[PDB]
Short mmCIF file of C-alpha atoms in Angstrom, two decimals:
data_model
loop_
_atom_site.label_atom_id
_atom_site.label_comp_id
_atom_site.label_asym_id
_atom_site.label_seq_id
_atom_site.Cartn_x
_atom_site.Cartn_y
_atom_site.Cartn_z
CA UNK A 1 36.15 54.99 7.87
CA UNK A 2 37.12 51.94 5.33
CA UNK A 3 36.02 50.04 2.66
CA UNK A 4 37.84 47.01 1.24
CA UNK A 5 37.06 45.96 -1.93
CA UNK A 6 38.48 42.19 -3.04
CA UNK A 7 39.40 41.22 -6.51
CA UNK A 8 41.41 37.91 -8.11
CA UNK A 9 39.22 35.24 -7.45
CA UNK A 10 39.07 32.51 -10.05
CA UNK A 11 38.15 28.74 -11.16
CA UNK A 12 41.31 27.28 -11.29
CA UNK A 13 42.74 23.02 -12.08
CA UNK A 14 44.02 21.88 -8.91
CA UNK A 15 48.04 22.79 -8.10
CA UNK A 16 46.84 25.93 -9.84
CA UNK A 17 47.51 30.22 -8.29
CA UNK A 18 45.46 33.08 -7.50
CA UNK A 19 46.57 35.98 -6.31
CA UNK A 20 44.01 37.28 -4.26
CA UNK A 21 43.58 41.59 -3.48
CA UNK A 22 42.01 43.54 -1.09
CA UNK A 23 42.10 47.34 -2.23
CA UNK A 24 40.80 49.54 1.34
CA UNK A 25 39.49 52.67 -0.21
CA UNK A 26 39.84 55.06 3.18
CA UNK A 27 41.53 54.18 6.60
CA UNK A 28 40.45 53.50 10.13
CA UNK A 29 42.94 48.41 13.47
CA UNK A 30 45.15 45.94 14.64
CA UNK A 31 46.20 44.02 12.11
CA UNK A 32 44.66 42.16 8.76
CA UNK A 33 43.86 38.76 7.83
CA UNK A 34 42.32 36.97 4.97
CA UNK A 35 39.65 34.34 5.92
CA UNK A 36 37.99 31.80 4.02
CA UNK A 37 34.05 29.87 4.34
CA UNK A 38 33.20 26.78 2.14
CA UNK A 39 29.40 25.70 2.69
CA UNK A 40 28.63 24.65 5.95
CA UNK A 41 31.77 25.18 7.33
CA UNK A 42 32.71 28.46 9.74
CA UNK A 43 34.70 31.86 8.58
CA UNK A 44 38.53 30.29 9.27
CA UNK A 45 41.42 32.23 9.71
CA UNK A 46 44.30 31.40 7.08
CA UNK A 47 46.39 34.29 6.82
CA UNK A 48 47.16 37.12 9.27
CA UNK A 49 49.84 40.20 9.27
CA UNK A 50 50.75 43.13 11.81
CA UNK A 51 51.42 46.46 10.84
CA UNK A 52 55.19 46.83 10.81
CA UNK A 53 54.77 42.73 8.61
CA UNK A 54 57.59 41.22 10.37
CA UNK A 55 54.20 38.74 12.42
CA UNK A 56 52.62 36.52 9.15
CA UNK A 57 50.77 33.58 10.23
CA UNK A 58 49.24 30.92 8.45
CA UNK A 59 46.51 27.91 8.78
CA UNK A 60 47.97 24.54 9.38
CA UNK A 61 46.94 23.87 5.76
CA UNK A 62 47.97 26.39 3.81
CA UNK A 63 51.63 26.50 5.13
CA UNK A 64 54.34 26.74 2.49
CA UNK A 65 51.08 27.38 -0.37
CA UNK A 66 50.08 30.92 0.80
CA UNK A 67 51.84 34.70 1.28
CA UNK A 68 49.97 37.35 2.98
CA UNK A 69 51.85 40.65 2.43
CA UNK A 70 50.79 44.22 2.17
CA UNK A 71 51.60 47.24 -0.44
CA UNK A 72 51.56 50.48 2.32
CA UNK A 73 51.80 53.10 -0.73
CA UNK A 74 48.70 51.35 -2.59
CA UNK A 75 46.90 50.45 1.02
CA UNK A 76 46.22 46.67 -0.53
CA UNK A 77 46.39 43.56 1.48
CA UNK A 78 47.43 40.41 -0.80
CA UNK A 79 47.35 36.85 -0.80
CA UNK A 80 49.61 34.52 -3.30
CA UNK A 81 47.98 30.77 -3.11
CA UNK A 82 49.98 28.16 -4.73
CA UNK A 83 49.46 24.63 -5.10
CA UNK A 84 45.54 25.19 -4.49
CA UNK A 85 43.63 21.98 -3.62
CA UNK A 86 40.31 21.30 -3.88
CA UNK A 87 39.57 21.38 -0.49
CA UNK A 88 40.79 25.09 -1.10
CA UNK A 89 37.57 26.00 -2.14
CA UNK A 90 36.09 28.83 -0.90
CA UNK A 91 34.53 32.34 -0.39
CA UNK A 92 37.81 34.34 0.76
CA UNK A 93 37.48 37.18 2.98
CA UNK A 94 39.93 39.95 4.23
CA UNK A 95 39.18 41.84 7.17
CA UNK A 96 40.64 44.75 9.11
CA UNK A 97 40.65 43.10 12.93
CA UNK A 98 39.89 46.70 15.22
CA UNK A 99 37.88 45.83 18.95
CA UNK A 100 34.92 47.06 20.78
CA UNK A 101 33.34 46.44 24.27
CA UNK A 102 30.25 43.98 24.57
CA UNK A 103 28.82 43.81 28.06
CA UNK A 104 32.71 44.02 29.59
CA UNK A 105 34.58 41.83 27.23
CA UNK A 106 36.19 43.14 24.26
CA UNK A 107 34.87 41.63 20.57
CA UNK A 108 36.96 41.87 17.02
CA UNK A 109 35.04 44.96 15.51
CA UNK A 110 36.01 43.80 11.58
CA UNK A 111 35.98 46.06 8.77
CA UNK A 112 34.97 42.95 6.09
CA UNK A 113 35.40 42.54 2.33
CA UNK A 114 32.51 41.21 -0.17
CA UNK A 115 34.09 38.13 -0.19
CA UNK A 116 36.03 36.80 -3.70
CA UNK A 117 34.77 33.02 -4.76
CA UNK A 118 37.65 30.40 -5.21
CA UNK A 119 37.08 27.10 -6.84
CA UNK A 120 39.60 24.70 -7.38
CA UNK A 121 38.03 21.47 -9.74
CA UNK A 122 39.10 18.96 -12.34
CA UNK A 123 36.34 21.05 -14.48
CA UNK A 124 38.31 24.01 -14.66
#
């Protein structure tokens, strides 16, 4: 089926961009969302888009700072994060959200990325 390959992570100052892509090399889903895990902390959802892109949603804390959008022609899933924070930092994730039945509930069957590292610091 699919394989999504992530690129544009970085080390950037804080109030700094990224533009974040996730290239899907083959097809298979319900939708698309880019996810993010610091250390210790669980796989949140911060961006999400439908197929037709007219449904975006966004984290609480990355409203206004973050674009999810999608190239159809080049099959690539983007996110645009401005004004990045250091509380920003993070391994970032996109996943293809399909489903699959567990015991007579459904579960989101994900087609995931490798993950691209972003870290926001002073150090940059």
């Amino acid at each position: 089926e699919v394989q999504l390959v992530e690129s544009g992570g970085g080390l950037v100052q804080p109030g700094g961009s990224l533009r974040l892509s996730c290239a899907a090399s083959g097809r298979t889903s319900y939708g698309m969302g880019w996810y993010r895990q610091a250390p210790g902390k669980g796989r949140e959802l911060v961006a999400g888009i439908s197929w037709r892109g007219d449904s975006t949603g966004y984290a609480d804390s990355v409203k206004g700072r973050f674009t999810i959008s999608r190239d159809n022609a080049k099959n690539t899933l983007y996110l645009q994060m401005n004004s990045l924070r250091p509380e920003d930092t993070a391994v970032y994730y996109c996943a293809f959200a399909a489903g699959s039945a567990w015991y007579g509930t459904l579960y989101e069957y994900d087609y995931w990325g490798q993950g691209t590292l972003v870290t926001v610091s002073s150090a940059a």
